[PDB]
Design a protein around this ligand. Sequence first.
Ligand code: HEM
Ligand code: HEM
Ligand code: HEM
Ligand code: HEM
Lengths: 146, 146, 141, 141
Amino acid sequence: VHWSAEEKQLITGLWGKVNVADCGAEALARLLIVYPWTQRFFSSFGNLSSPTAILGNPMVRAHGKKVLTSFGDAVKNLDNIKNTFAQLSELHCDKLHVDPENFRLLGDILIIVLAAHFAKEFTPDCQAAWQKLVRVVAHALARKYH
Amino acid sequence: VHWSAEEKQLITGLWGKVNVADCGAEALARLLIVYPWTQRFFSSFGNLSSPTAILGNPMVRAHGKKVLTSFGDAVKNLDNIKNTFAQLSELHCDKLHVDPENFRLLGDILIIVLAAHFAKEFTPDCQAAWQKLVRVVAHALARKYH
Amino acid sequence: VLSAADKTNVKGVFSKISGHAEEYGAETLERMFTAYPQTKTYFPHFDLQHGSAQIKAHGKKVVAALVEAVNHIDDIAGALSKLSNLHAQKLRVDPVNFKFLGHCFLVVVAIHHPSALTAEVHASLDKFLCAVGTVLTAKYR
Amino acid sequence: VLSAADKTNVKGVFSKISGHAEEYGAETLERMFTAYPQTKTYFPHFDLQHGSAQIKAHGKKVVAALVEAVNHIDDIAGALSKLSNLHAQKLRVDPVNFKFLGHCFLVVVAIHHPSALTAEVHASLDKFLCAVGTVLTAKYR
Ligand code: HEM
Ligand code: HEM
Ligand code: HEM
Ligand code: HEM
């Protein structure tokens, strides 16, 4: 729950170069493709019958942007994370009933998606900071049970 | 994090009939037997080469009592759980490096161990309350990361 | 992986519960719906009230499928290939739910047949339930 | 379960990394030791300093074992039966650690060969890593 000064610069510096739209769409598309059961939650997005259909689906692409924007709010409120995700926690837990393990899977997809987008710039120390950020956001969403 | 009055009576009433020693030893013995990798943490207990050796090992039996006693402290401090497990959290996380998933497995073993000890008295509403208690204790131990 | 020992232990316990497939199957689903409410989202068409005929009928089918898997324990993937498409392809059941159900199952046998659920049988039975869960999610795993 | 499609995708990507088994193997272990410190408890005898000869040598062995599994992808359990006893019986590696390692692996290929790690290959590669993890813990699962 405590951030070293080094971690903040590490996540912050990187966020500024993130293409929220492309990475957002790629991360969400990957969650629906490598972990198929997650598609059950997005029945309202229409066509999700093939990887291609999924990568081409505009709603998937659009929702992806919103999710990553949501991560940006965390990057700017590194210490106010609970409040920032309070209402999202209720949506996912009480209205959707998404099991917290899935938050962990999305966070990992996001890590590998950033690695492919930054390559060597995504150093081991950098990955470690982001892994932490992703676990905190996941924990802040898995609150309604706690 | 909020306990209904019905849940408290449900866990409390049951705790009073718990044979801390037998259930403690049985639960710990089962963790080492159905989830073998957990034995790595108890190398100092000596002989753990067979289910029989494990069920007969006195240290396993003795440690089992301590763990269940630890659950009793939670039953008496249903609202002060964080403090009660604060130092145990540091031991398990920082000194032992036990992955939190194992806390979840021990809690389940404990649930089935209580069912075999109370039979029908362990109603679905009763199981639900205990499942919650076990998840809270697990969460309070998986804090050092949070 | 299931050993000769596990196969024996599992068959041992299933002989004792074969008689009450409906009863144990219903109790298993009710405890699941009660301790893990999130699972109710897969049965919006069901009357989830305790004792409902739908739960008794389905609980029965569920244990039967389990029995079927015990009898073809050497190739559980083939014996349940149809259930695998249903759960993984059509229903898209989140894999974590199979552990919830399996746990509630162990609980009902612990309650009705404690002496039979020894530590070792528990281990064998846990391996078996995990095997079934792997096969029913097999499609996307 | 590995399909004809997955087998092809996995072989595809492994052709590209076969050349750098030591390099990728070392980076994989270092990222693992850095993002999941708890894993260091399994290597008390190792010099865990970045660049250490022990990590480079071991990282090499680890990728080789992976390659061996690709080539006998139809029976991964037989090709790795010796590693399975080591990890599950002797070492008692907690199963959760295999996912950490597998994840760090996907990360190093994403970094060095992004164009090759398409969504579908990612899925195939994820299935494969999960298969290997199942086999190396197989003894007690
Ligand atoms: C751990 C990171 C996660 C974050 C930060 C996140 C963020 C978001 C955000 C910002 C929204 C609201 C969009 C809006 O109000 O317009 C949302 C909606 C939603 N999320 Fe998540 N989410 C996460 C994980 C998940 C997972 C794992 C699933 C599915 C298994 C999921 C399923 C949904 C669904 C179904 C909606 C509603 C979509 C719709 O409007 O049709 N989310 N999420
Ligand atoms: C989630 C419930 C858990 C509770 C309430 C619990 C409780 C305890 C308690 C009370 C002690 C301290 C004993 C003393 O100071 O004399 C202890 C020690 C320890 N625990 Fe746990 N524990 C839990 C889970 C685990 C798990 C899952 C493992 C192993 C995977 C574990 C491994 C240990 C070890 C190795 C020790 C030290 C034993 C020794 O003194 O040699 N604990 N635990
Ligand atoms: C050991 C695991 C399980 C077994 C052996 C099992 C068995 C079955 C069987 C035999 C059917 C009925 C097929 C028919 O009526 O023709 C079925 C249907 C279904 N299963 Fe499972 N199942 C298992 C786990 C799960 C889990 C964990 C969930 C979700 C929490 C689930 C949700 C469903 C649903 C919603 C249906 C259809 C029910 C209906 O519409 O009548 N199953 N399952
Ligand atoms: C895809 C998974 C893995 C593969 C393919 C793999 C492969 C190997 C191989 C080939 C050996 C070396 C055998 C020899 O030198 O003769 C080995 C040893 C070992 N593995 Fe793994 N391993 C894997 C995962 C793990 C994980 C996740 C851990 C723990 C965090 C682990 C801990 C060890 C240790 C401590 C040794 C012995 C090292 C030594 O003393 O030199 N392994 N593994």
